[PDB]
């Protein structure tokens, strides 16, 4: 099978761009289309993430489910090759992310919006007058920090602290990234779903495991504990009345490992890479698209 | 050390990627041989079966290509509880049946899996026309108003993608399904196949919104419990799981409230607002072209996703 | 019916498909011609695209 799109510029390239933009192979970018021969426009982020002041990271997450995914290698002038993404191969991908997360070995990388700043991320292309915005591609494990901090901070809006939240932290090195305040009608939408999986947990979580975690934490201490400070909340003290039965614990508990496969499956927004044999000294690793 | 030379001569050639053709009217060998795919059925003759060389490791090749090979799961229900007219291109839905040692499943079309739904409360005038009693197929389900009662209706019934072959037997039909791979035919002219599924159950959620086009678009069955009895609609998409499930909490948007309103939920079972599972993926481009269904009698409109890829996941809920 | 203190200019603009006429002088453009090379891009289940 032959993956092969080559992008055609529609003016030259200065040689400015050129050295920025050879710097930047190897990183994963998104295509419009998936024929021959796409133009400049439709190619990365930066036509849903505008050159503006107020970001939307769940529609760029809509973009980048919803397209394709490839990697450039060879760019030269009016022209660059790129390499396109299908399930069913495997392919190399290179770690050439300025923010740099190590990897772990054998997990599963993800791709992501860039949280990381406009800037940090972005070629500009004054010759065809547009930009290309490049996606950040990190780790599964700190993707899913990066969003829960992400839609924490959205909900955290109204309330108030705010760099122990709007910066992660990592083995490598702890970074800042960019908080917008308003994510849109879809960012609430998310926080919509999220909170109607949430009400639906609380009625139908089970209360064994709450009479068992009042004696636990008078009992016991632990770092899985010592978040509550020793205090018993008040809906421990206002909901372990009741006596404890197995069948409605049983019937509390078939529905609720239904529904968190959903709230997991719910958070799989943005490609998953499940890669294989990461090398830290070729900084490449196998991978397949998931 | 020079057989090594000679095993890698017999390893090394991938398949064709490019290919500099001259002119179209030449048809060079080298351009037949970019574009002959092995074939998979031919005539009983060692020389035939050499040319066709299926006895060829995994692949096919003439003593990798991106290509798989489809599986083709077999099954075994009572005659009665299916019809020979059904089309073959139409994803069929197993059953679990209750017995330990069962070995004769119970394989529902969404057609017969209406009047599933139906009794008990165009197109149903076919699928009464086709499964003329619902008796015979109230019964392969032995417990269907408890089950539906305690919405566990939908972790039972896992999707077994489209149909390909129906030998009609006399008592108990044996059909072969594809439960992965590309969905094609086994007949001696290996016809191409379209799966077919009726256009009142199925509305497209791409134009139900009135840039970013990929080539596969997936095909999504839902279950979905209504207290007017459960409903099957299927759904075509071109948008990811995570995706599909938010915009298909707003497709459900008014019959959410409106189980809600009829029916107070009492117990803590009937939350469930059923259930989605991906049935797989095809071109985004020529997709869905529309075809008629004719019984003997009448005539159902009906989509026909031509050309289908079939993946079956497990059922993820809406809520 | 009756005029407010305030004039105005109404803009506007108008659409027209010309015929246009494409003139060059002779070997202005010199260029190479590649090779018209074909490639195998998917293997959908049925049907393959060059």
New interface residues.
Partial sequence: ????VVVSLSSRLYTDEIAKMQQRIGCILPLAS?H?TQNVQGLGLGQVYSLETVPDYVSMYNYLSDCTLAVLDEVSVDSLILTKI?PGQTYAIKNKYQPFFQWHGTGSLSVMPPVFGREHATVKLESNDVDIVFPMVLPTPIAEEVLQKILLFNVYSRVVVHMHLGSVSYLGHHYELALPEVPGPLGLALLDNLSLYFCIMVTLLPRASMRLVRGLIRHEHHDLLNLFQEMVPDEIARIDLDDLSVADDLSRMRVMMTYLQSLASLFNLGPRLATAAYSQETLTATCWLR | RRRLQRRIAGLLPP????????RGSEFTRD?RG??E?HAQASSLSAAAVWRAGLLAPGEVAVAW???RPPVFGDFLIHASSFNNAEATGTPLFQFKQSDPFSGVDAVFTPLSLFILMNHGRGLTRMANLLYDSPATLADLVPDFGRLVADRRFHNFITPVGPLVENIKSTYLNKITTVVH????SKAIPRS??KVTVPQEAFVDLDAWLSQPCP?DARLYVALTYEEAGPRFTFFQSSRGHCQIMNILRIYYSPSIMHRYAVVQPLHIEELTFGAVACLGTF?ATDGWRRSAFNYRGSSLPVVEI????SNVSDWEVIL | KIHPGVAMTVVRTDEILSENILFSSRASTSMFIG??????????????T?
């Fill in positions: 099978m032959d993956l092969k998936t021959g299908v | 398949p064709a990627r490019r290919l500099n053709i001259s351009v970019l574009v795919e290509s991106g290509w791979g590309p969905v094609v191409t196949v080539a071109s031509d050309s289908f890829y | 090779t018209p090379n074909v490639s195998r891009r998917e293997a959908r289940v049925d049907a393959v060059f």
